[PDB]
Design a protein around this ligand. Sequence first.
Ligand SMILES: [Mg+2]
Lengths: 90, 54, 251, 165, 268
Amino acid sequence: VMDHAACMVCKAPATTVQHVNYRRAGGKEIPEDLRALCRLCHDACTMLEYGSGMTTNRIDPCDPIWRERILAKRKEIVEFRSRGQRFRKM
Amino acid sequence: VEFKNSPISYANAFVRPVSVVKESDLVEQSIGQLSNYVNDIRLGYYDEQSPVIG
Amino acid sequence: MLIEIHMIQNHSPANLNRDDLGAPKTCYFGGVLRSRISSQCIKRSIRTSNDFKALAPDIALCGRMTVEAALQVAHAISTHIARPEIDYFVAADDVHIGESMFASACFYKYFSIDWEQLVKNLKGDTNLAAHTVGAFLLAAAKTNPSGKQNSFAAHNYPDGILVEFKNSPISYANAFVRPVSVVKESDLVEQSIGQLSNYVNDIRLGVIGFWFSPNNRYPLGYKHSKLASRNIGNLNELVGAVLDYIGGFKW
Amino acid sequence: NRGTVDFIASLENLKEGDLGILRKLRGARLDEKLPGFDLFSALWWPLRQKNQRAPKREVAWLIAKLFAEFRFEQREGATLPILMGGICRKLEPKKELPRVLARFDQLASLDIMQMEEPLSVIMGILRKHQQVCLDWVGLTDVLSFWEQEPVKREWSDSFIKAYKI
Amino acid sequence: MIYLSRLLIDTGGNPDRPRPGRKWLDNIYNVHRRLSMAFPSGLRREQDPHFLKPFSPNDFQKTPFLFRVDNNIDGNDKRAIIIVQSVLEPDWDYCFQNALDFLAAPPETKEYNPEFKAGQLLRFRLRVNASVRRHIPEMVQQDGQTIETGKILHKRVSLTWDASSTPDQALADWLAAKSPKLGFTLQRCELLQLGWVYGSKPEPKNVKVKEQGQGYWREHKYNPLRFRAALLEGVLEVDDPKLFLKTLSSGIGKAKSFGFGLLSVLPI
RNA sequence: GUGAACCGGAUUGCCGUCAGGAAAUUAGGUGCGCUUAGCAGUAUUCCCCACGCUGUGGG
Ligand SMILES: [Mg+2]
């Protein structure tokens, strides 16, 4: 509701949520560790965190230093992804 | 290189093992952890009557 | 009133104190063997050193031949299982194989200061008693035994001090009944300080305390608990806080 | 533990093409290749939605790689430090036993990111010594807590007890 | 002055790949909003030049712009065209600085100072909102039997013709009934493409009072938006100067905030 | 204020010279994704303000 259902990087509507940090889990969740992004941005920042080992603090889409990496990853995702593999889940 | 009046060893920067991640190499992370410990000790046990440089 | 100092420090591979057979000194605790540095090592380690020499001082604090010394030092104890090793060395002729041995451990120490006996031994002096207390604080925070230090240059610096003003003398050695197992998401020092945290969080549920950590590296307690009264970032500031809690006292 | 069992069942529900695609991605991370990431996501993420104790991304990816390479049958009671130990007896005590023992005890100095090739050669010597059964669930549950001493403490203990028989 | 712009969208190629620009066009609220952030606040463009902050409606200037979307341009490639008319200078480098994959060509802008004389032959293209507000009784349920309730609804429905007249004749009558007030007269008007437009829109709704207070917890609820569209092309002649300019950059029909009035004029 | 009070097991040390895991192996044999579908000639278009008993203006 707060983000007006708009992505934080590319401004397309928002469907998922990424966690900026994991200080509190499960029982307590202040809505300042959460940002609204769409599917391509979620997958891009998910693949940016496969082997990082940063544990607590995750990627902030507001910070400009990650934007050029994220857009190149999104260009890779648009270049390479097969939709028909995502559907028909094998 | 450094100059003291009392011997201070900085071996405890590596009590946590260094795990190689996809971005950096072993050398840069080793000297980064060493820099973190050096910064923390410099901002910790520090007396104005005998300041140090290096 | 008793001023009690809690002390956690890590140490590099060396051998500070040894017995007649040469072995690193070792006590028994918690069902297993513990690395040990003698209290009669920290005495004559801090004592007669150059940094500490800064009514006569160093007699009321530590005695010599009914002196009634007002400082008590306990035996340092590791927070994990002792893991000794033996090194093989050979000699040259430059024109036979021996064995030396060493041990590495993180030790918890404990310091207690009687204020009333210190004031009584100062013939009514009070600024001198607090002066000697501060002097012992700066000495003890920056003193190591002079063991096999030329070959094993062990010159490590501490990683946390908590100071207490409790009514009766009580140590926290029972916090290390369970030996510390190292997990991937932590280290030895963090888990040791956490085991110290989940023994001061108790007792009160089942006094005050000043805490210091260098540039606030490993904060006491893994929540926002008030288990320590104040968390400080300098050794001089912690000493000034101790003097301030004793009374109006400037360093 | 639940969530593991459905993960191993979904691994066994795979077909030829999926096993080949995870086979070609051996020795790599996931973020480089997109079909592998998508297949792993479609096979793993609903379980993580439903169950909280579903396997981590790295351990699940590694176990998927090993299952795609070796394709052992799932059967309870065929865990790794038992078949190691039942195998070690048939070798010469002077030469081959320390050779196999060193490769087996090298695992206590490696991380989950570094534990693909030693596991590859250990299941290789299984496949060479004509074995078809292996407890994958037990291996996943011990790998998920591989960084604890009692887990590798009961590792070689199961070994010693199988070897002494 | 009047500012016109053009945006080009591929809308084609391999269907198996993600196409965010192709996906953006399925909702008219999203299209209108995406054109709507093209005008920041003098303060906003100094605050976040990277456009990497939460989007709020109040930090952007308000201007009643008009737009239309067209398709079917060949040349061995497919294209989708958005034409935006506005009274302020658009900032296309700020709206799409993180959305370059939407468009197959960089945006363009140009000035427009249309000066005309009375009685001039002009070619126009317009998509009109065919809507009439009517009195409707209330039908409910329809669970195999119709239940009537006495409430009469004042609602906006589509224009309806009879069974004996063509849609083009009735649309032309509906446009010539209005052309004397705008300042133009028809000679020919034919129907090209008639249809419906769907849209969906976030609307906040209260759920639960905060335990700490100071507001609610809220949840997004989505409301349908249906309109009738009929695309028309023809030739008109001017009847008044400041009146034809009163017709332009103001709108002819309704629903102008969702791209339902735009006159594209060519002197034939 | 205790078989207690005072109380360093300390100094010396290169494991350094010597080594091919090597010879030889087809993963080949068989399979239709098939029967279906106007983005339009309509009879309610989700909400709001204003004026009359349908025409403007905003989402
Ligand atoms: Mg996005």
